[PDB]
Amino acid sequence: IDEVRSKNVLKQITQLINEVTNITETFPLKPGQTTEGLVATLDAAVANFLQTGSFAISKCPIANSDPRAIDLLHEALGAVQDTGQVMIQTGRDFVRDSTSTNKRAIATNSGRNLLTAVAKFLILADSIDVKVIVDKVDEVRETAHQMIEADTKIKVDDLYNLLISQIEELDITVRRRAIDLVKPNQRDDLLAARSALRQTAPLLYTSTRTFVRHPEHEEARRNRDYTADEMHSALNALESVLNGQQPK
């Protein structure tokens, strides 16, 4: 549970685990419902989870770039399908012999296993969602790399035009991630790195642009090197914190 870094995930899994392991009171059927209907609903809910899960995985922007990641996701979804099958079977056994304390216990155990598999899927899903953010950091890093290496003023401007948009995109996702982070120190560290990136990139633009125009100018070289180092540190800091590590 201590590896869970998303509050959205944390609350969902807390619901999953607490509710199914803390059943005390029981209730009659809701109006119009049947024992067979309870199993039918469960069956449909398992199916819909699998369908939505498959769609979500197929749309994941790093589907190409990270094949082992997608493989883990399919594996974890498969564990939901499997425990789901056991739940539907033992659940059916229970509702058909609903006074059997022992069949209730077995069905309850099946439920724990299924909702735990759902929780593990969500935890893995968050880690892949984080990899997507890290991929965006890498994109910013490469564009900045190219900007530093550019040999013409026109290239520096065109690359900074790209960088502006990439950093704006990254800024949105990082701010939202910060709001969702469980640990306030990771939150604060992520926001600090965000701020450093926003301050450093415009300075990298103007230091690189001045240096391509005046290469003989040794303070211009120094300033560009210094701002480049600052840029690299901020990007590394974002990646470090997204991965649950301290920056620097």
Binding site: L16, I23, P28, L38, T41, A45
Partner: peptide, 27 residues
């Protein structure tokens, strides 16, 4: 949107359907 975000509603419904079955009092 993200995978976690997309799975919020189906997680709830699956949770709901499991709890509904397990909290059935019997005959």
């Amino acid at each position: 949107t993200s995978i976690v975000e997309m799975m919020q509603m189906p997680t709830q419904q699956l949770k709901q359907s499991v709890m509904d079955l397990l909290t059935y009092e019997g005959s």
